[PDB]
Design a protein around this ligand. Structure first.
Ligand SMILES: CC(C)(NC(=O)O[C@@H]1CN2CCC1CC2)c1csc(-c2ccc(F)cc2)n1
Ligand SMILES: Nc1ncnc2c1ncn2[C@@H]1O[C@H](CSCC[C@H](N)C(=O)O)[C@@H](O)[C@H]1O
Length: 221
């Protein structure tokens, strides 16, 4: 629906936006750092479905936080659960400030990657959980499908892929304030299936203010 005229401007505009964003939890969420406690706890519950003892138990050795920010999700959610954690982001400033935000537990952060997801290729057979939260709006429909295709080959046995992002009620919403596109459940599930991934669980985050978009979590492998 003519979402992006010249995809180059899409990435360039968004990248410039986040360079001038304060490396605070409030800055990571566009001024909504007060919901970080709600998100983490529901992510904690949604993740236990595959961490609790069962038929195909997901490992606890390594995880990959995409987007990752200054390490908001890394610190509260991933780091307490997994041995080592990797992070990937396009804004170098956030990864530098992460070392102080994470602090003592940030020493177990194994790798810091500074590049865009459209160019990032995770190492194969490396991660048990690949967390992707609130970043998919900055990728094109084709790059998001190509990226998920690469993440499938980087998963360890029983590893999963988690996507937690904003979903529109009707239509594609272009949010030019940060150069991001918001999709509905249909377009997202088409891209997920187009990468060769299976839907394991789908849950909607509740207890969230009505002003923000609807938030859904997908479990893939
Ligand atoms: C809190 C939440 C969930 N919704 C919200 O407040 O929406 C407003 C509307 N608009 C202006 C401010 C935010 C973001 C954009 C949020 C914060 S940041 C974010 C995001 C989503 C997708 C991306 F690709 C990148 C960031 N979502
Ligand atoms: N095209 C892109 N490729 C890789 N990262 C991107 C990107 N566009 C935006 N980002 C990153 O995604 C984040 C947007 S919101 C950050 C959310 C963060 N994952 C969290 O813990 O809640 C910014 O940190 C920005 O650096």
């Amino acid at each position: 629906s003519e979402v992006i005229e010249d995809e180059k401007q899409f990435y360039s505009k968004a990248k410039t936006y986040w360079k001038q964003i304060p490396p605070t939890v409030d800055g990571m969420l566009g001024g909504y750092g007060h919901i970080s406690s709600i998100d983490i706890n529901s992510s904690r519950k949604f993740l236990q479905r595959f961490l609790r003892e069962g038929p195909n138990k997901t490992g606890t050795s390594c995880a990959l936080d995409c987007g990752a920010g200054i390490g908001r999700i890394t610190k509260r959610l991933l780091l307490p659960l997994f041995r080592e954690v990797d992070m990937v982001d396009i804004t170098e400033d956030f990864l530098v400030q992460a070392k102080t935000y994470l602090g003592e537990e940030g020493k177990r952060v194994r790798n810091y990657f500074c590049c865009g997801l459209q160019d990032f290729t995770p190492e194969p057979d490396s991660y048990d959980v690949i967390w992707i939260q609130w970043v998919i709006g900055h990728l094109t429909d084709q790059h998001l499908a190509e990226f998920l295709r690469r993440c499938k080959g980087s998963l360890r046995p029983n590893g999963i892929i988690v996507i937690k992002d904003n979903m529109a009620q009707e239509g594609v919403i272009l949010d030019d304030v940060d150069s991001s596109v918001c999709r509905d459940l249909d377009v997202v599930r088409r891209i997920i299936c187009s990468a060769g991934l299976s839907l394991l669980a789908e849950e909607r985050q509740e207890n969230l203010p009505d002003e923000i978009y609807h938030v859904y979590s997908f479990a893939l492998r």
